[PDB]
Amino acid sequence: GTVNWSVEDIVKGINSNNLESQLQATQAARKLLSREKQPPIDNIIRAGLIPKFVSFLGKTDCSPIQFESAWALTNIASGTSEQTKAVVDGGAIPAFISLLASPHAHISEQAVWALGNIAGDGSAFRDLVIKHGAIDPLLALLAVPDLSTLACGYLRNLTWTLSNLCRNKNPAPPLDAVEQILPTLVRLLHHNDPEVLADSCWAISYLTDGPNERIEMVVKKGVVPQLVKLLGATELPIVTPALRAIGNIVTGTDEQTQKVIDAGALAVFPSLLTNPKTNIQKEATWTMSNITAGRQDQIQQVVNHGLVPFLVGVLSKADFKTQKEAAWAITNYTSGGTVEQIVYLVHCGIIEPLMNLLSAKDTKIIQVILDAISNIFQAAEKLGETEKLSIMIEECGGLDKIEALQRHENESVYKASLNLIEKYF
């Protein structure tokens, strides 16, 4: 043989009245479609084979042709939106959902895989898969006392497909669907397989990527301690989605943010804020910026965990996108912090790295930094210490950056700049 058939040969066999012949041609098509160098997906579609493949899904007496067409349709569905649409238009969604019940584990797994590709196209196909009733049979495949008695590759594929049912926005998944899936997802979040664990974190990060009501659905399931545990893992494919989920959560209410602090997340941040992977430092700092946007007692938690020197470090040397988050973290800190907390920030050395970033061409970061300066001067005014801080910004060259920015293109930048000049500078 079934290796390297022409498409016209495949058509001839599928159009024969002979189920065995059809099986040989379907396998041939599967082998064409499973080659890494540009599989002929459009050719297979243009030959009108998808309806015949979908009808083979229902041939319970010929499980080999069920598997071969399932695999063939899987790889078509893995293509572009137009190619996934052709699989959907051929009626494949109900047929795959029926296959979830097959007594042949490799066939139900293939159905699981295919639905994951269809659902992975976007919210519309995701919700169509849900409306056809995929969730109940998928979850029933995972209704065992001990997950570790399932085949590793089977369990990984189910986790990945479930994570696609949690993915995408505009709109987010149906509330009923999320709430039906969550308990199984919480169980997978405690499984020992690193790939199951990564995809479960990814699913949780999707569900926490939204309004506070969505964050609350997840947090109410008690998964935040497990997220913090996974946050400390050595495997970066696990840390990345774990940090994403934590960062999502601390964009919600102050009470939801507090659960992350209570679970111990801040103790991991010395390593996260120096992590050699650029994306980890960026999203660790982004997470910090939304904690320092919180309550003064939560800012005080950041101080107590020794994280202000780590913010000074990121602000001093990091990828610029990480430095921008660090600028945000500081402006949030200085917006809500106490005078004593703001003084502590200055004593840790925030001024000079904050000045140096006034050379960046990013207009938003200059605004963010200039706003932090006002907040910090405001604290010095409640102490008569403005003069001593004015000198600090001068003594490290900050006022060259400020007394120049008064002639900037942006109006809000020019206004804050000459204001800082006239009031102190």
């Binding site: 499973s34 890494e36 599989p39 899987t74 893995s78 996934t84 895989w113 994951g116 992975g120 994570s163």
Partner: peptide, 8 residues
């Protein structure tokens, strides 16, 4: 992570 993936 991958939205879609073929079987190889």
């Amino acid at each position: 992570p991958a939205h879609k993936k073929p079987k190889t």
